[PDB]
C-alpha cells in the first residue's frame, strides 16, 4: 500500500569536544589539532646550518679566545650557544654586548682577513697567564696588544683604506690597567688614549686605572669595541698607549643567520623549525612550545590545544 | 544549526551509517535497507576540507629577531623588549582562538544545511506521490520495490508513473 524513506546523517561513538561562537564544548565527529604543543627534544641537522658553540660563546669565538679556535672562519645560518660556555682569556667587558652579539650573529660568519698594520716603534704580539695557548702565555688571537719597544711607546698614527666593495668590521679593544705601575711599565705614559676614526664617525675612549675583581689572574680588563667602514671610506687609529689593536677584519654579509640559546643536542632529521626545545614540524599553524623560534615555524599562541571541527555535530542515540 | 535538521527534526544520527555523512533508510514491502547519499556527503567534506586547507597554509618564516629571554635586569629597553612580544603573543593568541570559534560554527551550520538540502531535494523528486511526517521521514503513499527506492536515491524517480496510484491513497 506504501513506504517509508528517512533521511538522516551520520554519528560516531567516539566524538570530540570543540568550541564555537555560542558554545565552549560541543560534540563534533571529528577534528584536528592547530597548536603543535610537543618537541622531540632535539635540533634537526638539516636543512638550516646550525653550528654548535659547545664551549664558546660567539664573542669568544669572534674575539679568539684558544679553547674557540676551531670557530676560526666559520659560518652559520643558526649559532647555538650553551649554558656550559665559559670565557678561559684575558678578562673583558663588550660596552653593549648585546649588539655586537646581534650583528655578528645576524652577519652569519667569523670570515677574518689579515691586514698588514705597520705599529712602529711598538712591541707586538703580547700575552699573559690569564690567557694560555698551548703551555705558555697568550691572547686572543684577533687582538694585538701592543707595548712599548725598550724605553718607548710613541704616538702611534695608522691608516687603512677599505678599497673593497664591502663592509668591513674592526674590532679593537682598550686596556684598563688595575695600577699605575702596570700603566707605566707597559705603556710608558702616566694616561693612555685610544682615537678610531672614519670619514663618518669617531670614538674616543681614555683607560680608566683601578682594580677589578680578580678573574683568571688579572684585576685588569680590557674592553671591547668595534667600527664599520664602508666601502671607500678609511680606517684611522691614533693612541699613545693601552691600544689592544685589531690585526684585520670581518667581512660583514646580510642574510638570515641568527643565534639561539639551548641545549638541546642536535640530530639528524629535517625540520624547518627550530626552538630552544628541539624542532617542531610546521604543519599546525600555532604552537605552544616556544616563543622563541627560527625558520619557517607556527606562530606562538598561549593555548596548548585549539580544536578544528572537520565534522558535523555528534548526536547519538 | 540555523536549519533546524541536525539535532531538530531528525532527532539523531546514525552510528550505523557507515559508508557516508548523509543518507537514506527505508521501509518497503521487501524489508529494510539503508544507503549513503554520495553528492552531499562530497559537499560536506570538500568545503571542510577547503577551510581546513586554508587554515593550515604555511605562512610564517622569521629569522634573526629581537631577544625574549633575559639574564640580568636592565630596565627601560628590556621592558619593552618584553612587552612588544607580549603584545605580539596575546594578538595572535586572540586571532587563533577567535578563529576556531568562527570556524567551528560555520562547519556547524554548513553540514546542517547539507542535511536540510537533501531533505528539500528529496521532496522535489517526490512532488505529490509523498508527506513530511515532521522528522525526516516520507510516507511514499505507493508501491515502491527496491527499484523505486533506487530511483529516488539515484536521481531518476518518475514522479508521473505513480501520481495516480499516489493521489488515490492520498485523498481516500
Ligand atoms: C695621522 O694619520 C692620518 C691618516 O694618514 C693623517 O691624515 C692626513 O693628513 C694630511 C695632512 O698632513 C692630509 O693631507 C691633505 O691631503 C689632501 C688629499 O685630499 C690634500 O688635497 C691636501 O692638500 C693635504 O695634503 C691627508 O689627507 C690626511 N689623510 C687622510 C687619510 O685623511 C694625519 O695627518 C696623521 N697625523 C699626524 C699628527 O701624524
Ligand atoms: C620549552 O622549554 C621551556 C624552558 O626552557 C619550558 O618553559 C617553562 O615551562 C614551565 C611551566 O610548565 C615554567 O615553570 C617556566 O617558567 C617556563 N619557562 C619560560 C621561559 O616560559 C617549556 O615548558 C618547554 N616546552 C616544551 C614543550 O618542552
Ligand atoms: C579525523 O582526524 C584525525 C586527526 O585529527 C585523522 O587522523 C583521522 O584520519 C580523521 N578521520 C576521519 C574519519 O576523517
Ligand atoms: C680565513 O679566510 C681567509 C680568506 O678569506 C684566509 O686567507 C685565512 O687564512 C683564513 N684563516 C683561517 C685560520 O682559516
Redesign the pocket.
Known amino acids: 500500500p506504501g513506504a517509508t524513506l528517512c533521511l538522516g546523517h551520520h554519528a560516531v561513538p567516539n566524538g570530540t569536544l570543540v568550541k564555537t561562537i555560542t558554545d565552549d564544548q560541543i560534540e563534533v565527529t571529528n577534528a584536528t589539532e592547530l597548536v603543535q604543543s610537543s618537541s622531540t627534544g632535539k635540533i634537526c641537522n638539516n636543512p638550516h646550518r646550525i653550528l654548535d658553540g659547545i664551549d664558546c660563546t660567539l664573542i669568544d669565538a669572534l674575539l679568539g679566545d684558544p679553547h674557540c679556535?676551531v670557530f676560526?672562519?666559520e659560518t652559520w645560518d643558526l649559532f647555538v650557544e650553551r649554558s656550559k660556555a665559559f670565557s678561559n682569556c684575558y678578562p673583558y667587558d663588550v660596552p653593549d654586548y648585546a649588539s655586537l652579539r646581534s650583528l655578528v650573529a645576524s652577519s652569519g660568519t667569523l670570515?677574518?682577513?689579515?691586514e698588514g698594520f705597520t705599529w712602529t716603534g711598538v712591541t707586538q704580539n703580547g700575552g699573559s697567564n690569564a690567557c694560555k695557548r698551548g703551555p705558555g702565555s697568550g691572547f686572543f688571537?684577533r687582538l694585538n696588544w701592543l707595548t712599548k719597544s725598550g724605553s718607548t711607546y710613541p704616538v702611534l698614527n695608522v691608516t687603512m683604506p677599505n678599497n673593497d666593495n664591502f663592509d668591513k668590521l674592526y674590532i679593537w679593544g682598550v686596556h684598563h690597567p688595575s695600577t699605575n705601575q702596570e700603566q707605566t711599565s707597559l705603556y710608558v705614559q702616566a694616561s693612555g688614549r685610544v682615537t678610531v676614526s672614519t670619514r663618518r664617525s669617531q670614538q674616543t675612549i681614555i683607560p680608566n686605572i683601578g682594580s677589578r675583581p680578580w678573574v683568571r689572574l688579572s684585576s685588569s680588563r680590557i674592553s671591547i669595541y668595534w667600527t664599520i667602514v664602508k666601502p671607500g671610506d678609511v680606517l684611522v687609529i691614533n693612541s699613545n698607549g693601552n691600544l689592544i689593536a685589531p690585526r684585520g677584519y670581518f667581512?660583514m654579509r646580510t642574510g638570515k643567520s641568527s643565534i639561539m640559546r639551548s641545549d638541546a643536542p642536535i640530530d639528524t632529521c629535517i625540520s624547518e623549525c627550530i626552538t630552544p626545545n628541539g624542532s617542531i614540524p610546521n604543519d599546525k599553524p600555532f604552537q605552544n612550545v616556544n616563543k622563541i623560534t627560527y625558520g619557517a615555524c607556527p606562530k606562538y599562541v598561549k593555548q596548548n590545544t585549539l580544536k578544528l571541527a572537520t565534522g558535523m555535530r555528534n548526536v547519538p542515540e | 544549526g540555523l536549519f533546524g535538521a541536525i539535532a531538530g527534526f531528525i532527532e539523531n544520527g546514525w552510528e550505523g551509517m557507515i559508508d557516508g555523512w548523509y543518507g537514506f533508510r527505508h521501509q518497503n514491502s521487501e524489508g529494510t535497507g539503508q544507503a549513503a547519499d554520495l553528492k552531499s556527503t562530497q559537499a560536506a567534506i570538500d568545503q571542510i576540507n577547503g577551510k581546513l586547507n586554508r587554515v593550515i597554509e604555511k605562512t610564517n618564516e622569521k629569522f634573526h629577531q629581537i631577544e625574549k629571554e633575559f639574564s640580568e635586569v636592565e630596565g627601560r629597553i628590556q621592558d619593552l623588549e618584553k612587552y612588544v612580544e607580549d603584545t605580539k603573543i596575546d594578538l595572535w593568541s586572540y586571532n587563533a582562538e577567535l578563529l576556531v570559534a568562527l570556524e567551528n560554527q560555520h562547519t556547524i551550520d554548513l553540514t546542517d544545511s547539507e542535511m536540510n538540502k537533501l531533505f528539500e531535494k528529496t521532496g522535489r523528486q517526490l512532488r505529490e506521490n509523498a508527506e513530511d511526517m515532521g522528522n525526516g521521514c516520507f510516507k511514499i503513499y505507493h508501491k515502491c520495490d527496491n527499484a523505486c527506492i533506487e530511483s529516488i536515491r539515484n536521481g531518476t524517480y518518475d514522479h508521473d508513473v505513480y501520481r495516480d496510484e499516489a493521489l488515490n491513497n492520498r485523498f481516500q
Open positions: 679556535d676560526q672562519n670570515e677574518f682577513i689579515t688571537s667581512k
